[PDB]
Amino acid sequence: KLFRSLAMTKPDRQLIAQVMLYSQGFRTAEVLANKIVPFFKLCDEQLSSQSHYDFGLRALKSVLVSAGNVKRERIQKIKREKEERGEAVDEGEIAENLPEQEILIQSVCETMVPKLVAEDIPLLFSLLSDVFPGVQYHRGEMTALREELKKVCQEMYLTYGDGEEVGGMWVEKVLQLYQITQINHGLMMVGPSGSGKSMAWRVLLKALERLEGVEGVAHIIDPKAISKDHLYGTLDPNTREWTDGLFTHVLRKIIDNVRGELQKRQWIVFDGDVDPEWVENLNSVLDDNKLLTLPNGERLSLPPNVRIMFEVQDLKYATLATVSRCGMVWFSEDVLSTDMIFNNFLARLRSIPLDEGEDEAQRRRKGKEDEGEEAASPMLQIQRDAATTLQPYFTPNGLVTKALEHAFKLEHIMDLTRLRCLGSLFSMLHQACRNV
Amino acid sequence: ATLDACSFGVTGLKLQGATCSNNKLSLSNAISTVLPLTQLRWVKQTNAEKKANVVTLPVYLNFTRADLIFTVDFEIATKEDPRSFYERGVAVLCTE
Amino acid sequence: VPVSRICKSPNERARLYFLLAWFHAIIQERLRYAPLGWSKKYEFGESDLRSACDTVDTWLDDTAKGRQNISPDKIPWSALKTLMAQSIYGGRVDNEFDQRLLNTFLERLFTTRSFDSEFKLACKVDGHKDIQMPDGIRREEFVQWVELLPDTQTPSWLGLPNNAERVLLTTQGVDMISKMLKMQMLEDED
Amino acid sequence: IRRITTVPLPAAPNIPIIDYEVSISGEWSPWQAKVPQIEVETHKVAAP
Amino acid sequence: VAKLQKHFKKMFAGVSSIILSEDNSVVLGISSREGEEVTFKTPVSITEHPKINEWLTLVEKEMRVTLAKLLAESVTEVEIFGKATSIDPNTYITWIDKYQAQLVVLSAQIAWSENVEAALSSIGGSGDSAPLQSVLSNVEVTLNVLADSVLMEQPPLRRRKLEHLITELVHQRDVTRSLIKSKIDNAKSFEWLSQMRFYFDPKQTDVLQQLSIQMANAKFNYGFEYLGVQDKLVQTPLTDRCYLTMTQALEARLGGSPFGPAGTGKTESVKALGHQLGRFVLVFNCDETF
Numbered sequence A: 001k002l003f004r005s006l007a008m009t010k011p012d013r014q015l016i017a018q019v020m021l022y023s024q025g026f027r028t029a030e031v032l033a034n035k036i037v038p039f040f041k042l043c044d045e046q047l048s049s050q051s052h053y054d055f056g057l058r059a060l061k062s063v064l065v066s067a068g069n070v071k072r073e074r075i076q077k078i079k080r081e082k083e084e085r086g087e088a089v090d091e092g093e094i095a096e097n098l099p100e101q102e103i104l105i106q107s108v109c110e111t112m113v114p115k116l117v118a119e120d121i122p123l124l125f126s127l128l129s130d131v132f133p134g135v136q137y138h139r140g141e142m143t144a145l146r147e148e149l150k151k152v153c154q155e156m157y158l159t160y161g162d163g164e165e166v167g168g169m170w171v172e173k174v175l176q177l178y179q180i181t182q183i184n185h186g187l188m189m190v191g192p193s194g195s196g197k198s199m200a201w202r203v204l205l206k207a208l209e210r211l212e213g214v215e216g217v218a219h220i221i222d223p224k225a226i227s228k229d230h231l232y233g234t235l236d237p238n239t240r241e242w243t244d245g246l247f248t249h250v251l252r253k254i255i256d257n258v259r260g261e262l263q264k265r266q267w268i269v270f271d272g273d274v275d276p277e278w279v280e281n282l283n284s285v286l287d288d289n290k291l292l293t294l295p296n297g298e299r300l301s302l303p304p305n306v307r308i309m310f311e312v313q314d315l316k317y318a319t320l321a322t323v324s325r326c327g328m329v330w331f332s333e334d335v336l337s338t339d340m341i342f343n344n345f346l347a348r349l350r351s352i353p354l355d356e357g358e359d360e361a362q363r364r365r366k367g368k369e370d371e372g373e374e375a376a377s378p379m380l381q382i383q384r385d386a387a388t389t390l391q392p393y394f395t396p397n398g399l400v401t402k403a404l405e406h407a408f409k410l411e412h413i414m415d416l417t418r419l420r421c422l423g424s425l426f427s428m429l430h431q432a433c434r435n436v
Numbered sequence B: 001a002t003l004d005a006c007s008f009g010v011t012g013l014k015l016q017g018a019t020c021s022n023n024k025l026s027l028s029n030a031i032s033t034v035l036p037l038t039q040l041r042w043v044k045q046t047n048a049e050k051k052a053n054v055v056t057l058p059v060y061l062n063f064t065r066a067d068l069i070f071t072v073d074f075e076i077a078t079k080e081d082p083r084s085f086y087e088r089g090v091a092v093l094c095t096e
Numbered sequence C: 001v002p003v004s005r006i007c008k009s010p011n012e013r014a015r016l017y018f019l020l021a022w023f024h025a026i027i028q029e030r031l032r033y034a035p036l037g038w039s040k041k042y043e044f045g046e047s048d049l050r051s052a053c054d055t056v057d058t059w060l061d062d063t064a065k066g067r068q069n070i071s072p073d074k075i076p077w078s079a080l081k082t083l084m085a086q087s088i089y090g091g092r093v094d095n096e097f098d099q100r101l102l103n104t105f106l107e108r109l110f111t112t113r114s115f116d117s118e119f120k121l122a123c124k125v126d127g128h129k130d131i132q133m134p135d136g137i138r139r140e141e142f143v144q145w146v147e148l149l150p151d152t153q154t155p156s157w158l159g160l161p162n163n164a165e166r167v168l169l170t171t172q173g174v175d176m177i178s179k180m181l182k183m184q185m186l187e188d189e190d
Numbered sequence D: 001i002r003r004i005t006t007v008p009l010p011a012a013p014n015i016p017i018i019d020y021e022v023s024i025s026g027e028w029s030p031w032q033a034k035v036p037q038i039e040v041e042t043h044k045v046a047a048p
Numbered sequence E: 001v002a003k004l005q006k007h008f009k010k011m012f013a014g015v016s017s018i019i020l021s022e023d024n025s026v027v028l029g030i031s032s033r034e035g036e037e038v039t040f041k042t043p044v045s046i047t048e049h050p051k052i053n054e055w056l057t058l059v060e061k062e063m064r065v066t067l068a069k070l071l072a073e074s075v076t077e078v079e080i081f082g083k084a085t086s087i088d089p090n091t092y093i094t095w096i097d098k099y100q101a102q103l104v105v106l107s108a109q110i111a112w113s114e115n116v117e118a119a120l121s122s123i124g125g126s127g128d129s130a131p132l133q134s135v136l137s138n139v140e141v142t143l144n145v146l147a148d149s150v151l152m153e154q155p156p157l158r159r160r161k162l163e164h165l166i167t168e169l170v171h172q173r174d175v176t177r178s179l180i181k182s183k184i185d186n187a188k189s190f191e192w193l194s195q196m197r198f199y200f201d202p203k204q205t206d207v208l209q210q211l212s213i214q215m216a217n218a219k220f221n222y223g224f225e226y227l228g229v230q231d232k233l234v235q236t237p238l239t240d241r242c243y244l245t246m247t248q249a250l251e252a253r254l255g256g257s258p259f260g261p262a263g264t265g266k267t268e269s270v271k272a273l274g275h276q277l278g279r280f281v282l283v284f285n286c287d288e289t290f
């Protein structure tokens, strides 16, 4: 009796998009709004339902703000390019002759495609072509980072491709990871097991090491293996004294910078399943506050060098509050083809001596190519010859591939994963050359 | 009736509160009338003024009218007020 | 409604109340004939009626400024139509089509032509007859007109077609048999 | 594998391929040759 | 006093901290999360009012007084742009920089409301639509200036101010176009009364009954609570309906219940309505943090 009720069933998406796009300086806002608004609902309906997808109005407004930022970046790019030449500059004149649809579709793709599953990306591109006809999103070219990726991949026995090749998707995904790390201060990789997310992150860190001349440090923590009290540190109920947890210890170590950690770049990677219980304290850090609060009452300010990262097979038990604060790159299982893993195996055989163990592991980095060390040991020659015998059967349509595809049809008591079988096979072949 | 490239056939539609003759509605006392093969045609949105003899009926999922699928614009056969269709609660149901 | 509230000046107020009462009747009885009358059963209760009465009182007090009479044109019809279309009764309405229906009812009733002696509250009642506005101005005249209304009411009073009744009964008819099916064998265990 | 492979396999009909080991020399050899027939003490007949 | 700086976000709407003298004996102003600062016209002397409650009450009083006194100057300056056929972009950007986002949007709204009121009074039953056309022309000129300025590279705070001004002026343009189309010719017509209106009376001595915000029956006063650079809401017709019904309920002393599916702007619309009237809103979440 005391409250008047109002049905706010359906907000006006079109006019909100119109006003926001006009606020960012877009010359055409009516057509862009009337296109983008139905497109988001089309994506919501057509694409397979997943927890991490978010086509609500908050996502739309963030996408439009990103589109405005991209537009302004393009204005500044054209302005500086003309200024380095001899020209007369006017911001409005430059902004007049630009495609707004290209900026908007670029922002939409840059914000959505990293989250997209491999099954849903071609559907999304079909929808985008339908709503935005005759407009295509060409990925921004990062030549220097791609060259460093090539160098590190050859250094770490990994395949590299320039897109639409063997390994193009993985290169694209690590580039997207770089983009999300640049944008956000917290991100996740949420692929299935055996998709190269941890390898992609390692390669990215070791490539930015060369690119930017900044030392990359990794702090890998399994959060579920350790208890929450040890993870975040627990206050003694009596005889008051603070015991820093592992994560708090790492944060305090970087904050103090005894060994100049502020100069270096450090990434904390929570390599384990995400749960609501151990991420409550991390919500404040992952939010825009960037502040860890503890029961001790201390307030640790996350410095800009830190980047809290996540690896999860899935986010089935992850709260939406945790997913919203973090960026995300979904590493679908069809990012790592069988050919890439076979190439990794055959490359590891040809250059890693199989008996020398760990003492010579450090010497791998002493030589950038290990010239004059082709005959490091007779073991290297034997396993190189073995790789030569084994290469015809590891092809993209060889014996191993057909055998694996047939075996996937067979029922196994334990779940049959690709990399389990492949690692078993590689270990057996290792033992074969050891027997020789 | 041949379907154009942009026309799709539908069946099983029921028209509550009206009869459709010559693609024009007329108020009827029948509870429901079975619509024959209905051609849904998508056309480029021409800048056409909304005619005064056009009524925007709903297309509900079933007789409960809990879920609305879409809306259809129909022309009025006689000089009847479109408001009479709103007062009469004229509608369309995908299923009875 | 208290008698003093309706009897307050200007003299036109009571007529508006009658219209408001008629409006509150027409939406309410129509809820019986859902889903035909409305898309869903809304809670058009007495609180909406009191809010509408307060709105009418405030607007007529503002417009008249104590005058014993105001012309029918000077009545703020737009304010009443908008408020009872969006604030009082329209707040509960979520379907756009029910909102359109409420707008049609308010535009048909709340207008200057309501004060004409020839106004028809419900046209083509039973397809042949009509219901005329009372020609009085006091509360007692409207109350007597209500008391003198026919006892035989059809859906055409509310704008629905007569066969709507024929629909409602058969719904209840099915509601009978299905209910008896829920009784057929929990009592009977042979 | 016998259907799609070019490598020769054991040429004994009613023996699975898994029952064969690959000797240090290239040729196959049945596992049954490498399993001795032993004699157990009467002391530990059920808990060896 | 430094230890107190973290608790202001719980007590005040936008005040994230208090600017203090080097010896921390006099409070000179307030600051937001975004760094926007309001400098008090009259500083609060902690030494003369040592008790925490006393000088905090004086800080609240001086916040309200200084916000009203700066809104007065902002309206006085923006009246020139309201009556001008052309707006110099440099002067407009200087005015935007000189004043806070809240006072900037309030000054724009006050100027538009007063101009439309004077226009509708001037037409006065003659049917001459020239004054409303002039108002629409001025609004469109300001929109063109803002659209040109926002494409340029701006500081973040000024960019937020420009975005807020554009979001408000688009709604003002739409409302003026609706009034012209409907041929409204009297200030007391409902088509103008149903739109939210701002009446600033600088002559009022009290500083909490100077700006009056009116919508249909409801006649609120602007509580001069500092809100910082808040996120403005695109005034859709649904949000306009929400504002109308919610102000009607407040005028009738009833409570408000915007119900609907998730993510439809309900709580944000209520927050925007409360911030438009300057009243401290406090959203209470109801998901395992209650």
Ligand SMILES: Nc1ncnc2c1ncn2[C@@H]1O[C@H](COP(=O)(O)OP(=O)(O)OP(=O)(O)O)[C@@H](O)[C@H]1O
Pocket (backbone or CB within 6 Å): A157, A158, A159, A167, A170, A192, A193, A194, A195, A196, A197, A198, A199, A200, A313, A336, A340, A341, A342, A343, A344, A419
């Ligand atoms: N770019 C690549 N080229 C070739 N092989 C690769 C590449 N990236 C990864 N692999 C192979 O895939 C294996 C699995 O990748 P990675 O070590 O990143 O594990 P993961 O996908 O995170 O899986 P898990 O769920 O087991 O942790 C690597 O050990 C390597 O054998």
Ligand SMILES: Nc1ncnc2c1ncn2[C@@H]1O[C@H](COP(=O)(O)OP(=O)(O)O)[C@@H](O)[C@H]1O
Pocket (backbone or CB within 6 Å): A011, A012, A016, A057, A058, A061, E233, E234, E235, E236, E239, E261, E262, E263, E264, E265, E266, E267, E268, E269
């Ligand atoms: N009319 C509108 N104008 C601008 N933004 C809106 C509008 N309606 C909704 N939004 C955005 O959509 C989001 C909806 O979330 P919120 O209103 O907080 O909770 P809910 O909508 O679920 O009640 C908000 O963050 C808001 O920014």
Ligand SMILES: [Mg+2]
Pocket (backbone or CB within 6 Å): A197, A198, A271, A311
């Ligand atoms: Mg991993």
